[PDB]
Amino acid sequence: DEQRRELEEKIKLKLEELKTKSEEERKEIKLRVIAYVLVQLEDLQKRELEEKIKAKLEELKTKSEEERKEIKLRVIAYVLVQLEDLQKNLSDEQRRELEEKIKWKLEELKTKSEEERKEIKLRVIAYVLVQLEDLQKNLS
Ligand code: NA
Ligand code: NA
């Protein structure tokens, strides 16, 4: 699967670059990823999708804390690859429109409690996982 291997190589490089960043930078990058996925979930924010997400959330809660941390890092690396690929397809003005939407979701995030923010991040991770498994079935 040339597509699957190329994607896994892109995720690997982003993981390696993410690990070399400071604790402070890692946090900012993680929050940007949450905010971007939130921008992408706006469309349906009020099927099947929420049933698929909820299944995945329930699956994630049976895992160890250490496995959920590794999953979280992979998700972040994957969204960084998708965000980079998305930006290549935008004009300068579309890129600035997207940054405005991301920043607005980031400010929205800051107003939440730690407990609500933890729930939002887990849901963002579940959605990303469902998308990627729904995606991996069309790569070769
Ligand atoms: Na550090
Ligand atoms: Na998965």
Author numbering: 4 to 49, 57 to 150
Paper text:
Here we report our attempts to design proteins with trefoil and pentafoil knotted topologies. We extended previously described algorithms for tandem repeat protein design in order to construct deeply knotted backbones and matching designed repeat sequences (N = 3 repeats for the trefoil and N = 5 for the pentafoil). We developed an approach for designing tandem repeat proteins that fold into a class of knotted topologies known as torus knots.
While kcTRP3c.1 and 3c.2 remained recalcitrant to crystallization, crystals of kcTRP3d.1, 3d.2, and 3d.3 grew readily, and their structures were solved via molecular replacement. kcTRP3d.1 and 3d.3 were phased with the original designed atomic coordinates of kcTRP3d as a molecular probe. The crystal structures of kcTRP3d.1–3 validated the accuracies of the designed molecular models and their intended deeply knotted topologies. Superposition of the structures to the original designed atomic coordinates of kcTRP3d produced all-atom rmsd values of 1.84 Å (kcTRP3d.1), 1.43 Å (kcTRP3d.2), and 1.90 Å (kcTRP3d.3). All three constructs show similar stabilities and the stability of kcTRP3d.3 did not change significantly between 25 and 10 °C. Collectively, these data establish that all three constructs unfold and populate an intermediate state, in which a considerable amount, if not all, of the α-helical structure has been lost but in which there remains some burial of the tryptophan side chain(s) suggesting that hydrophobic interactions play a role in stabilizing the intermediate state. As with many knotted proteins, apart from MJ0366 which is both small and has a very shallow knot, the refolding kinetics of kcTRP3d.3 are complex. In contrast to UCH-L1, for kcTRP3d.3 we also have evidence from the interrupted unfolding experiments that the denatured state initially populated on unfolding (which we term D*), undergoes a conformational change over time (with a half-life of ~200–350 ms), which we hypothesize is associated with untying of the knot to the denatured state observed in equilibrium conditions (D).
